[PDB]
Symmetry: C5
Subunit: 249 residues, 5 copies
Amino acid sequence: FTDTINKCAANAARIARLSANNPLGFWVSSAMAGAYVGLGIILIFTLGNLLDPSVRPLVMGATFGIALTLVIIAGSELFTGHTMFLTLGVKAGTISHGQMWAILPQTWLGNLVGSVFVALLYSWGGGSLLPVDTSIVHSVALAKTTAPATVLFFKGALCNWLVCLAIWMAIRTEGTAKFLAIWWCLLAFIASGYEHSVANMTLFALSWFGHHSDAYTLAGIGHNLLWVTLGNTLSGVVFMGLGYWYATP
Amino acid sequence: MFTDTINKCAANAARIARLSANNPLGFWVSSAMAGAYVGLGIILIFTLGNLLDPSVRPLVMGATFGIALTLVIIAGSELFTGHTMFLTLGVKAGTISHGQMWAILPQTWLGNLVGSVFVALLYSWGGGSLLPVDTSIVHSVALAKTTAPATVLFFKGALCNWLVCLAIWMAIRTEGTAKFLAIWWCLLAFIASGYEHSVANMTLFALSWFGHHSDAYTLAGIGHNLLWVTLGNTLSGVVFMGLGYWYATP
Amino acid sequence: MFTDTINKCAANAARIARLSANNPLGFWVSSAMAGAYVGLGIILIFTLGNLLDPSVRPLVMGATFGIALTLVIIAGSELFTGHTMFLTLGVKAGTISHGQMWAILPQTWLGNLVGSVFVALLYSWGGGSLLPVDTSIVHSVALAKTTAPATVLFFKGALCNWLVCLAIWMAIRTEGTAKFLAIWWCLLAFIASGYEHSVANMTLFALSWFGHHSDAYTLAGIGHNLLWVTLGNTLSGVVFMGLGYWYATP
Amino acid sequence: MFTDTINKCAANAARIARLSANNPLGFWVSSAMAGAYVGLGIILIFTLGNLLDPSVRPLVMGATFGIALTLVIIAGSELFTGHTMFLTLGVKAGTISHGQMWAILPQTWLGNLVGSVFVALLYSWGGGSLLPVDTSIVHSVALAKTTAPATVLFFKGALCNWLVCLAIWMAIRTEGTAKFLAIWWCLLAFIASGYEHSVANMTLFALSWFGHHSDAYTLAGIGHNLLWVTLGNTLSGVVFMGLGYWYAT
Amino acid sequence: MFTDTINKCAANAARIARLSANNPLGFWVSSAMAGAYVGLGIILIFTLGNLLDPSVRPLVMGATFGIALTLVIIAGSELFTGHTMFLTLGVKAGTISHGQMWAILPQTWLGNLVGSVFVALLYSWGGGSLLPVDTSIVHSVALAKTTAPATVLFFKGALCNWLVCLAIWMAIRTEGTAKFLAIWWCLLAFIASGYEHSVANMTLFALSWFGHHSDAYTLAGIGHNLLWVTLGNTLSGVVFMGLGYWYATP
């Protein structure tokens, strides 16, 4: 896997030059990834909200794949992806430890602005997920904000294993195969109940700007984002980055 | 890369300009084509939607709308919502003037209308089953689209053309079947999410207009919708996509 | 754009012409093949539709009709409805004469009919389950097609061949799998929207004819549909596609 | 010259003759595989059709049978029903004689029969759930196939192998995934239209024979269906496809 | 025929033998991955199956299991069940010794075990919904698997790995998305037919064990299944695929 490792390492060095030399480009590109994932979340929640509970995992997982397709094919900068690229970049010597930790929070924030931005436009566009309190947007958001730390951490680990696996298979494949790679892993992660930090940003923002109940708070959103973010970072850094690094000649 | 994609977008912008200036009959036929192609897709999804529960309409209408941008891009034609992106990029790369951009756009818009109205007419002469029946989802959706407020329609128009331009963008960055999938994804996301396409609406509105529509459904209502939806489509084409990618490049 | 595609259609038209005049036998085999292939498609979707609720018949029958044109294009055969486009572009490019176009089209038509009647015969001798019951959708759909007004039939036939020629067009402009997707989309769209395919009707008509059809179903009814559906197919092939794309090239 | 596709069919016929004549073991292995592979598809579609209302069987069983000819063509093996076509083109092209063609065909049919019986037996030792209930789908369909009339069976086998060969033919004229979709289309059209495949039947009949069939189901019955379907299969492969495309150029 | 593929597979055995001898860490990781990857596919299909009517479980669980071997092959990892085929062919071609095959084989097995157990464990710590409710299909499918007769499990294992090696074999002989379709088809077929995969069972078992299983579900039972399905898996890997294609070549 030295070819795939070098391409990821070349990418870590590209992310850095963008961060350092083109600040405007970096921020636009990070906000893009959040908006793109968010457009996917609006799609899957719209469809889930109309359907019986027993088919939601299947339809929402099967139709979420647009989210990473946009991110990877359209082009953008996705925090959860950075956790792997930047690990590989550090391990190969194309970027440093300090550059890694300085870039990640930046991608995280741009993703956030882009998520809030798409949920805002959806809200001004009078989106139908928003005004009714029984909307799946609110009950999924609330449940997400009140789950224990451990549960959220490990769900965040599992999600980013798959999402990074999708990034990884897409770099190793061509044409349509990238699309199937993306499709598969997004099905597995949504249907299986795992947690994606950047997907959550849009979900939480959608619930915030609608008729959420009193028990839904900025704190609870903070809680979920803290622990999912760490767990996404575990799988990205260790399962995938260090994992494949240690797997090659 | 990003620069490669942008240059292709700017070359396409210079190509549209010329087509407009040098070959007007082709410009109009190609424009009429895009409107008709989107409408054929509108006839398809509305015929399917009319036979389904509300709770599966968005999914099945969304999953079967892909043909619309597929025809526009693969068969070849000129689509207004597409130009909003290409022309911006041509202006910014320098291959066309700001002037040519704003002179082309209303031409593409009108051409599309001609094809949209044209395909709705044929369908009507063709005893299309969606027109005469006052309970059809053609009349009800077209009614709701005409009386939604401006802000709502604007922002749904913005969200629609982000996605449709993303399809355009992604089809250019990819090859063979990947093109059909990118298009598929984005048309499913836009339809199922509730967003608004000016050009597709031109077909839907002409279908409702030619059938037994609500006495509440007016030319003024059609005007209200096409106005704010168009402006919306334009914001995302120009700013989120055209300018957005322009500033993302190092 | 479009110059390469047009030249390919035009080279195809000369090839069709050479085939017709130099190897008449292969002309007929290859035309019979197209009617038979389209037929194997019609048997498929009527078998499926025959068991489902009327409300999902357009979706299912549309989604599964793709094989028909996939066979025609990828296995290789001669389809009258595609000939309407190819030959038009051939006359326009100068590769064949007006005279050659009109001498050929009726032959392709006749060959398609032979292959159609023929695949229907085999299905019958094969004790196909669609035939013996009066309630079969083969009988109710064939009869509805035969008593429909000329006007309705024409414009539906025009709308159909737009879509089928669009599939042929897009297939010429793409490679590998994308051909199959282009074809799938267009056949979803024409069948599910209600549109009329002249050659595909030939098989349906023969299947109902060889089965337990009602007395209301006559050869005059069949000829009535085939006349207007054919003329309508020919309109969209010749004008919307042939002449359309001819005047669209800068 | 001939067409590329005809020249390819005919090279394939010459390669069949050589395998038959120089490598009997290879031939028998490679024919056994095709029977097993079609058989694997048959177990699949009957396991699914078993749980489904009759009105969705032709659709679901049709839509899921594509693996059968996918294994045959992509994995690699010798299928009787495709030989009828290949060997005709060889004969017309001059690469093989009428003599080699008629000597090979029965060998292919038998090796296919062996692999079909072999995969049935494994499934049967594997406690296959389709076996014990004489009223469930393998036994009722198996029974009705053995008592159908000769004319009906012959013309159904004609229309089946038209489609199965059209799949073979289109797979030769295409690359990559297009081959898979060609095959998939064709096996949906033949299984859902009610058409009969001699080799597919060999596994169905072997499943019903080795399971708890009613005593109305007999060896003479199985022989009755196989005789007429094999003959119909041969009519369309030889004539509609081989002779058909031979005279189409 | 098949000589290239055999030789790819033989060259793969030699690569495997090299990883094992000069990079045990990399070996173990790459084994564990494969087990964890399969386990992800298992967690998916059981989560889907659990909410569904039993009459659509084989279809849906089969149609969605594809990710398992797709991760294995396309991301890359080392899969015991694949090894049974690779190593056999390398032995026959002379690229590895009999001695190597037998040293490596239970190594991959253990690594796959460690990985399957590992993903199960993460899913337990992440409050996986499949675990706590006794009637969950993770528990009932797990139990039925553990008490089935040796002979039954053996021949279901042989038939499973026939299919899985066929996917791997077809993936080797194809490109691009085709690798993906070959895999999807084989995993549909094996999961929906009732066949038994040793490594996937490893995850399913760990899951049950970490959840609310009945008293009747024991380690001896998990043992019984892992024994006989592994052995059946090995039969079809070695003999039906390995020696099978080996003796199928001129």
